[PDB]
Design a protein around this nucleic acid. Structure first.
Ligand code: ADP
Ligand code: ADP
Ligand code: ADP
Ligand code: ALF
Ligand code: ALF
Ligand code: ALF
Ligand code: MG
Ligand code: MG
Ligand code: MG
Ligand code: ZN
Ligand code: ZN
Ligand code: ZN
Ligand code: ZN
Lengths: 343, 334, 360, 29, 367, 364
DNA sequence: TTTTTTAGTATGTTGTAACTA
DNA sequence: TAGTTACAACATACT
């Protein structure tokens, strides 16, 4: 259960192998690369047949037991690949997994892939069973801050030269979507056998495809990055995200700012964060947001938000996206005239 | 389902029409909550289903009475919203309508009770029109509503209207004083808050609702001098917000009425709070605040799935804006 | 086998209907000439008799003697249609058959010849709420139905229908029956049933019917049931809360002078007695309209209301026409918002309080 | 302000004042 | 006896009213020989989409040859008119929406036509097809065999996928004009030996509102009411519209603050027995027309020739602002009309409101 | 007769393909160097050349000469593929075959070696119309494909595909086919067809195409029929006018310029089309709202409305912010009062009149 | 590092299990 | 002795 990174996975496999491998993450690209590497190493060691399966509450629990019993003392080298439940592991899955740990042989290998396990699930019986029999590798998608380092390292792997301008363009056009970015680098290498890529070259063969979440949109509004806020909304609209989800996510943060701003007049702001259990990393954005915004702007934002909610619920209007764009610009400190607000 | 003394006269009149064999297949009974309209309908349905009636009262020993007491009768249908749903759908109505067309299982009459026709959806109401207009032989419909105006016009034209009047105030207050132990001022305030409907006032006292009202008054007492109306969010944000908004509206009206000069006031138990409202607010502001409080209450009850905290938070912030000098006020529209 | 008046007195012949002369004349001419159309659409307010006319039309088409505008009412086809168990007359409750699959099954049925009658009428009622797919299915067959099929449609809100379906059928718009027509019909029905009645009682019922004869019969049954088997002015007045002599006049006079104490006392006394709050507003509106007419011309006021002639004329000379409009507008808003108020009394108090602020 | 416009405001009727007379092409007078 | 719309159909390209641009394109294509394999017809109701498409099928499969002027006498022509031609396959997309039906259709295109030169598939109300149905047709529609043509008719082409549109030639019909509708009605009635009057036909054409099926339906109703005659009196009563002279006279009285005349007109209107909603609508319509004329002299149409000079003088005299005040006042009255105790009371009070707030001659205000 | 322009002028070589440099260049390098993947995905707008490129790639791999970026186009294999009667090339219409029952039969014969070709290429059109089971069957056979088969995927909706299939194939995203590129191809086709044309006619058709070359050919064929064997600017301009649907943007431009005659002409033609007047006001409100936001920030306008980006930008620069607010407010009032107007047509006209002249008098 | 969702009614496609012609 | 009907899961459109 030694947490590592996919880059170190190849070195770890070369040094030696184990009965089980448990890699958790939410990045499809990293999971596929790790799965291929493990499969390649297993094939080299002499494995001839491999198995794939999925684990979830919908899957029959007795079926998992039969798969565990399928292992035999005298059998060829086999590999079994499993997938964690979409929602997450539960007590029954723990019983099935710990049963598998008892039924382990060198011939059979255990591979499970899925989302990161919550701290509550860390203390599960099955996890403790494979404390030493398995290794752990995180496969979380790098954030925008850490993205450029990953791109440069990946480019160096394919012996390609990327300028600073080219690196920024790739991150901007493929933020949160590594699979497209990985293939984008491959296509550029085919186009230019020289191996050196500049700003004019990359721009020709780069399209727009990125994945965002409502939390990113809220974060942009607090910081004040108007360009990102509009860009995120456009991507979310193209994807087909439900407007109601965006309203609720913004509601909790907006209401918190109103409460903090109103009651911070006569008390230090540090105490307010402590009693509201505000995350440490977010203290910086909250503090600057309150100073930039004013009470009048907050009231207008609440009024605009309320009208948008009413229109969606009863009027069934399709202009909800237009209202969101107006609200985003309002929170970016740039003045917005009336008539658009409060109807 | 408690039978109340004042239902004695109305019940006798209705039974006579059915006992004479000249009843109306559709009956609409309107009454305020807590007036025991369900009990009146329940008694009528029990009499109709009885196979060997004994005057007005049911025998209580025939097969029909035994099945009715057990809670299952082949020819007794009920239409009510689901446990988590606040409205009655069209699938249920079509289910009952199809079953009515078939021959009676027990060989007697068939009775359908609608718990609240005000909760019917537009699709549900229309599906009920054709069957309600020309029902088959020996079929009786009973409906209960709080306000027939909201009911569909075509549907309302099918049924015979019957109105239950609340008893006189002096009779009501005496009845409450016997049921519970409270001062006269408290009894009058509860009765007037419930629109003079006994039993509804009893519900306020028997439950914990009265304590919530006291908290609201104390919070409102502190907000008016300082003007920090935003502090009232804690006392108003609750699953029973429509009830508490009604209480707040009543306080505003009493203060406004006192400003013009009047004798009767709904809130008689707390003269101090209404006095503060009149002194620190002008009549124009009170009317503006009262108008939106009623409007927001209607949206909260009418719109399904509407968030509660956001609406109330906007209300308090909006009200604080009005109190500032040089701010226009809303006007009724059409 | 007792049945209410609204169900017992359904018309069985064209001559038995009330009003709608233009609709009957057009239908009678078409049958006589032979200019028979495929699809007919009847629209109007509730209780006007769209279903009654449509059912009568079906009887004439399939009558044994021939296609005539005066059904005999004695032949086998006529009686069965009256009972409602005629094989060829297919009646569809569109309110409960919104599903498209039901419509598709219906279309496949029309290909077959009629059993006994020479026409196969498809009477569709409450057709204003079929699913969009159901409407589009009817378009192709409705445009060019087979020789031996007819379509009769009835609706109350034709605005919801698609424009395409309307263009394929003849539209007959029915008007609300007049007060005199309603009153005459009520007197005729009561006389045939041997039930006592009074002149003013019928006038009140007809006035409250608001042009719907279905509603008039419903009120008549309610009065009879609670009127001890007879219709009397005192019984009807108690049925629907009606102000007696000057309940509205006193209230408006206090409102105009902006006297808070008088208005609240009058409302409190009225509440204790018990009256219809909506009726109070209607009468107050009527007085304001009459006062406005007097200002336009002193002769507008009728001679019947001579008991309070002096008081009303004094108001007309004292209040400018503009202020009368404000009071009239405010009371209309109160009536609009009365059903949505927390309490009916509470809504009225809000309406009166708003009007008291107009006075300087 | 005047009483006429105030009463119209309370009555729910808006007043339109001409802004671009050149747009109209005729003897508007 | 037979319905006019069903009895009278275009059996030749010369019998269609309007839509000249579409006919010109079709005639040129057949003559030159540049025949496509996918046609899409769009427009409002009763414009002639099905009639035009049916005519096109007649030309392609005519015995003489591919011509833009079908003979109308050969076996193929007459059978298509009767709608029982083997090689003319007409599909009701409204009643056949499931993809299973669509796949059944695609399994028959391969077989050669029985007797006709081409196997023409005419799909009506194609916008009702399911999403999967569109994609099933998508591949075959691009490259059909040599002996199949697809004709599509839809009232709302916006529902179709973008891909389907690019694979076919799209012709958008236009609503017929008043003069075109009037001329057609004159020809039909004259051929039917039915008397008529010039004013009655104008009213019917105006009420048609850019459709020809509507006009024919109204004509059938009018004939029945008039016992074989189409008179202006019968049509006016049927449409429930009073002559513009009465409505204009009432407006003229209102602007001059002649309340007594206004009351007299209302009493006469009550005796006439016309819905009070109609009076407000017509008064609003005239006021709107005056504003349009005041904007541009050419706004007024040819239909209102009888009262042309009466409206022109009103536009010159009344300032634009006054027209707005009268127009808006009636709109508010129309909103509150349902809530008034009676229709007469609602309309009468609305007029008194205008007189009370007259721009130049208000009612006398007492001290 | 005379075939159709779309069917007749199918591309037959990598040189005939218009644009798409970033796709053809990559394919040519891959085939020449021998680095060939097992799965290819093509995505782009409708009628942009996804199927045409796929067939060319298949012909190059299976050509007699070898794996060459430029197929000879003369050997037996090349002609058979073009005619669509080549055994080793299997073309499947996924739209018409969605159930997994048919998919299994197709995938059973993947193990068998090609009869007469180096590779057995499976071409799947509209692959986004496959059921859940079909994707599972396709994924199963695609995880471990034989070295002697290839899979070419073409679709316009890559989102619907499962992420598992996307991660196991190289995807090329075809770009919109410019404007001038469409014009050049039309000029080449017309003169090769001996058809008269004018510079104005081609430019109008190119803009109406909106990035799709198939649309241009369909419009060009329609224009020729209307022009009676010729493509004249008069005939083309009339045809496009009959198909115009940009009334709302035209109204805003006329409204700002204060042209009563222009506004009425737009309304008259709009009525002839049969537009819903309620819809017209809503879309006009959206345009006014969009223009206001563009003034607040230049980035408020996205790529969704690139067809009219230039016109929208011009309005923002010239019109002061106050005028936009006044016009937007007036239309809001008009929409509310539309139901009670004497007619929907009259309601829109009156509201537009109040937009040209007159302005509301607000309280205080 | 951890947070996200209005509700009702109607239509269409694919896959699996139980009961009847 | 094998097919049809009914039920479950997933996706889309309009109010
Ligand atoms: N024109 C009429 N003449 C005679 N009776 C009528 C008329 N209109 C309505 N009624 C009465 O009202 C009752 C219901 O009318 P109905 O046919 O249901 O009209 P609708 O279709 O509008 O509901 C009938 O039983 C009939 O007695
Ligand atoms: N251009 C036209 N010329 C002659 N008659 C027409 C024309 N358009 C419509 N009609 C008449 O309208 C009737 C219905 O037309 P229809 O075929 O339904 O058109 P659509 O398919 O557009 O609804 C036909 O009987 C026809 O006589
Ligand atoms: N890049 C291109 N170069 C030349 N012609 C093209 C191009 N893209 C599309 N076309 C034209 O579009 C027509 C149909 O293309 P199609 O195979 O439908 O492409 P898609 O599969 O993208 O819809 C062809 O006749 C072709 O001439
Ligand atoms: F017209 Al009805 F019930 F009023 F059918
Ligand atoms: F048959 Al249509 F518009 F009614 F084509
Ligand atoms: F976009 Al296509 F065939 F229409 F690939
Ligand atoms: Mg009816
Ligand atoms: Mg048609
Ligand atoms: Mg293609
Ligand atoms: Zn009993
Ligand atoms: Zn008979
Ligand atoms: Zn011929
Ligand atoms: Zn070759």
């Amino acid at each position: 259960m030694i947490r590592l990174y996919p880059e170190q996975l190849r070195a770890q496999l070369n040094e030696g192998l184990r009965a089980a491998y448990l890699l958790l993450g939410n990045d499809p690209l990293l999971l596929q690369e790790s799965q291929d590497a493990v499969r390649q190493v297993a094939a080299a060691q002499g494995f001839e047949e491999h198995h794939t399966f999925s684990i979830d509450p919908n899957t029959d629990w007795n079926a998992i037991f039969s798969l565990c019993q399928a292992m035999s003392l005298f059998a060829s080298r086999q590999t079994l690949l499993l997938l964690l439940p979409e929602n997450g592991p539960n007590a029954a899955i723990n019983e099935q997994l710990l049963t598998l740990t008892g039924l382990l042989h060198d011939d059979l290998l255990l591979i499970v892939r899925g989302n990161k396990l919550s701290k509550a699930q860390e203390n599960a019986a099955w996890f403790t069973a494979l404390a030493n029999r398995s290794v752990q590798v995180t496969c979380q998608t790098p954030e925008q801050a850490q993205l450029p380092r990953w791109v440069a390292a990946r480019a160096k792997q394919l012996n390609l030269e990327l300028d600073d301008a080219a690196n920024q363009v790739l991150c901007y056009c493929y933020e949160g979507n590594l699979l497209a970015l990985a293939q984008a680098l491959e296509r550029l290498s085919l186009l230019w056998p020289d191996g050196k890529l500049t700003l004019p070259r990359v721009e020709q063969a780069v399209n727009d495809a990125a994945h965002f979440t409502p939390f990113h949109w809220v974060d942009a509004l607090l910081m004040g990055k108007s360009k990102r806020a509009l860009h995120i909304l456009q991507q979310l609209r193209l994807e087909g995200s439900e407007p109601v989800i965006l309203l609720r996510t913004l509601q909790r943060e907006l209401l918190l700012l109103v409460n903090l701003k109103r009651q911070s007049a006569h008390t230090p702001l540090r105490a307010l964060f402590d009693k509201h259990r505000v995350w440490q990393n977010r203290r910086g954005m909250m503090g600057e947001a309150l100073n930039r915004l004013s009470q009048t702007q907050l009231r207008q934002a609440v009024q605009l938000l309320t009208r948008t909610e009413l229109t969606l619920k009863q009027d069934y209007g399709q202009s909800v996206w237009a209202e969101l764009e107006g609200l985003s610009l309002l929170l970016c400190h740039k003045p917005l005239a009336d008539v658009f607000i409060d109807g | 389902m408690r039978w109340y003394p004042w239902l004695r006269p109305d019940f006798e009149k209705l039974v006579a029409s059915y006992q004479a064999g000249r009843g109306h297949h559709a009956l609409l009974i309107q009454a305020l909550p807590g007036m025991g309209d369900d009990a009146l309908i329940y008694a009528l349905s029990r009499y109709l289903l009885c196979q060997q009636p004994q005057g007005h009262k049911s025998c209580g020993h025939c097969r029909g009475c035994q099945l009715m007491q057990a809670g299952t009768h082949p020819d007794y249908y009920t239409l009510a919203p689901e446990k988590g749903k606040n409205t009655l759908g069209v699938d249920a109505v079509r289910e009952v309508t199809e079953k009515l067309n078939e021959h009676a299982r027990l060989g007697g009459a068939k009775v359908v009770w609608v718990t609240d026709a005000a909760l019917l959806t537009d699709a549900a109401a229309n599906a009920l029109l054709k069957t309600l207009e020309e029902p088959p032989a020996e079929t009786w419909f009973f409906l209960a509503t709080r306000e027939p105006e909201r009911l569909l016009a075509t549907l309302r034209s099918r049924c015979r209207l019957h109105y239950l009047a609340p008893p006189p105030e002096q009779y009501a207050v005496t009845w409450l004083s016997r049921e519970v132990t409270m001062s006269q001022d408290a009894l009058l305030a509860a009765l007037r808050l419930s629109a003079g409907s006994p039993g509804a006032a009893l519900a306020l006292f028997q439950g914990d609702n009265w304590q919530a009202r006291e908290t609201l008054c104390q919070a409102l007492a502190y907000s008016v001098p300082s003007g920090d109306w935003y502090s009232l969010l804690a006392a108003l944000n609750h699953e029973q917000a429509p009830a508490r908004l009604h209480w707040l509206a009543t306080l505003l009206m009493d203060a406004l009425k006192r400003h013009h000069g009047a004798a009767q006031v709904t809130n008689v138990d707390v003269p101090g709070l209404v006095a503060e409202l009149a002194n620190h607010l002008s009549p124009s502001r009170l009317q503006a605040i009262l108008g939106d409080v009623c409007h927001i209450r209607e949206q909260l009850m009418s719109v399904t799935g509407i968030n509660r905290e956001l609406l109330i938070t906007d209300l308090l912030l909006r009200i604080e804006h009005y109190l500032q000098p040089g701010v226009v006020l809303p006007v009724p529209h059409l | 086998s007792y049945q209410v008046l609204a169900r017992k007195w359904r018309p069985q012949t064209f001559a038995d209907v009330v009003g709608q002369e233009h609709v009957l004349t057009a239908l009678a001419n078409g049958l006589s000439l032979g200019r028979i159309h495929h699809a007919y659409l009847f629209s109007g307010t509730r209780g006007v008799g769209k279903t009654s006319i449509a059912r009568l039309l079906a009887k004439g088409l399939n009558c044994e003697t021939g296609i005539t505008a005066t059904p005999c009412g004695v032949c086998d086809n006529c009686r069965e249609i009256e009972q409602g168990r005629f094989v060829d007359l297919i009646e569809i409750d569109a309110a409960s058959r919104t599903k498209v699959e039901d419509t598709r099954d219906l279309l496949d049925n029309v290909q077959y010849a009629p059993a006994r009658g020479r026409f196969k009428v498809y009477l569709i009622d409450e057709v204003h709420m079929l699913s969009r797919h159901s409407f589009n299915a009817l378009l192709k067959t409705l445009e060019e139905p087979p020789e031996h099929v007819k379509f009769l449609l009835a609706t109350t809100d034709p605005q919801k229908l698609p424009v395409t379906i309307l263009s394929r059928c003849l539209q007959f718009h029915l008007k609300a029956l007049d007060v005199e027509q309603i009153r005459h019909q009520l007197e005729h029905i009561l006389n045939e049933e041997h039930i006592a009645h009074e002149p003013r009682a019928l006038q009140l019922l007809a006035r409250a019917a608001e042009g719907s004869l279905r509603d008039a019969l419903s009120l008549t049954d309610q009065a009879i049931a609670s009127g001890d088997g007879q219709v009397s002015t005192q019984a009807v007045s108690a049925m629907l809360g009606t102000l007696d002599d000057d309940q509205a006049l006193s209230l408006v006079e206090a409102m105009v002078e902006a006297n808070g104490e008088r208005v609240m006392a009058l409302i409190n006394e009225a509440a204790a007695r018990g009256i219809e709050w909506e009726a109070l507003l209607v009468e107050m509106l009527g007085l304001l309209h009459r006062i406005a007419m007097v200002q336009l011309s002193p002769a507008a006021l009728g001679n019947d209301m001579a008991a309070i002639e002096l008081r009303m004329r004094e108001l007309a000379r004292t209040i400018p026409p503009t202020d009368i409009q404000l009071y009239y507008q405010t009371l209309l808003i109160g009536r609009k918002e009365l059903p949505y108020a927390p309490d009916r009394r509470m809504g009225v108090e809000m309406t009166l309080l708003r009007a008291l602020a107009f006075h300087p | 302000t005047s009483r006429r416009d105030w009463q119209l405001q309370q009555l729910g009727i808006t007043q339109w004042s001409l802004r671009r007379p050149g747009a109209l092409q005729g003897e508007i007078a």
